[PDB]
Ligand binder design. Structure first.
Ligand SMILES: [Cl-]
Length: 156
């Protein structure tokens, strides 16, 4: 089973949002059994915690699932077929951890409007509900390219 994992720092806002969203989208496409989707954080200050109440709030506001258990990047995640970094800091950490460039890609590099320079997804933790809605929109705009990536991989 193909494995894609999203990575941010605390695994309570950005990455879990991308995880639930992409996983649900795959289910709608009937590809839920063929692709495993998870997420983790580079840090461990939230291991075991649910997603941020505001993150679950926006997910729910758009009809997506919210169940989540925060975790720090481990063996399981580093063994994914693709590690999706939320921002450039996450990417350099995963890179420096030993993951080759081809397996570390920033989420926004999948946005159809993306240029060679991939943009960061901002952390909404210290913002307001508006910031969480914006993070949702940014992620929503980037995922279509990840679906193409999955289609290419499943062909294998
Ligand atoms: Cl974070």
């Amino acid at each position: 089973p193909l494995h894609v994992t999203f990575v941010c720092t605390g695994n309570i806002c950005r990455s879990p949002m991308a995880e639930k969203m992409f996983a649900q989208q795959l289910r709608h496409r009937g590809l839920g059994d063929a692709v495993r989707v998870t997420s983790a954080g580079t840090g461990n200050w939230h291991v075991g915690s649910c997603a941020d109440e505001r993150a679950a709030g926006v997910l729910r506001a758009h009809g997506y699932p919210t169940d989540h258990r925060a975790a720090q990047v481990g063996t399981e995640h580093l063994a994914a077929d693709l590690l999706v970094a939320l921002d450039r800091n996450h990417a350099r950490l995963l890179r420096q951890l030993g993951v080759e460039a081809a397996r570390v890609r920033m989420l926004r590099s999948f946005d159809p409007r993306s240029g060679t320079h991939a943009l960061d997804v901002e952390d909404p933790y210290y913002g307001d509900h508006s910031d969480f809605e914006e993070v949702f929109a940014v992620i929503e705009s980037a995922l279509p390219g990840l679906h193409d990536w999955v289609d290419e991989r499943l062909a294998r």
